[PDB]
């Protein structure tokens, strides 16, 4: 009742096709194709949570570098002082996006934070 | 009733669990017998 099969080769060929552009025996050699599928997926996990964290960090330092161009000592903390006292609910650090896509509009943002 | 449309009721025949066929199946690896001892080795084992 012999049971020679082919399902390991489709099982294995799917993982073989996912492991393209892995520079060498991480892209050809099955017994490393498995663990590069595995380590590639957990790399996708931690780099996804830390792409949320990392783009948060990037917008913080980008709008900090935008506000510090005034010359007078107005930090990023004081922009949030007078960004929540003057009631602006949650611009979500997308003013770090229109701070470079619309620099006159972020000058209107900050020049209305002053008043 | 045709030869086609016959089927047993649910709960009448469970599937026999196969051991050592994957850890997602439930009893993979050491097949549900811990690590070592007489309970894991193959043979008559222990007199009841």
């Amino acid at each position: 009742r012999v049971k020679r099969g082919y399902i390991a080769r489709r099982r294995r060929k799917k993982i073989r096709f996912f492991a393209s552009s892995f520079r060498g025996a991480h892209s050809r050699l099955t017994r490393t194709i498995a663990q590069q599928k595995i380590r590639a997926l957990v790399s996708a996990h931690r780099d996804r949570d830390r792409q949320k964290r990392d783009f948060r960090r990037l917008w913080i330092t980008r709008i900090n570098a935008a506000i510090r161009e005034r010359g007078v000592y107005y930090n990023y903390s004081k922009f949030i002082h007078d960004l929540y006292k003057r009631q602006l609910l949650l611009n979500r650090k997308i003013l770090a996006q229109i701070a470079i896509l619309n620099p006159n509009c972020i000058y209107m943002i900050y020049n209305e934070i002053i008043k | 009733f045709r030869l086609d449309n016959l089927g047993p009721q649910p709960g009448s025949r469970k599937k026999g669990k196969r051991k050592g066929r994957g850890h997602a199946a439930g009893q993979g690896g050491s097949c549900g017998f811990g690590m070592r001892g007489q309970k894991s080795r193959s043979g008559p084992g222990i007199m009841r």
Partner: peptide
């Protein structure tokens, strides 16, 4: 090890036009 997947139920929206905005101008 756990292979699960996730298809986020998203919605594409096309924009028509913006109106109702003619109060307190703040030009510089």
């Amino acid at each position: 090890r756990r292979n699960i997947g996730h298809r986020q139920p998203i919605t594409r929206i096309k924009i028509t036009g913006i109106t109702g905005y003619e109060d307190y101008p703040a030009s510089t």
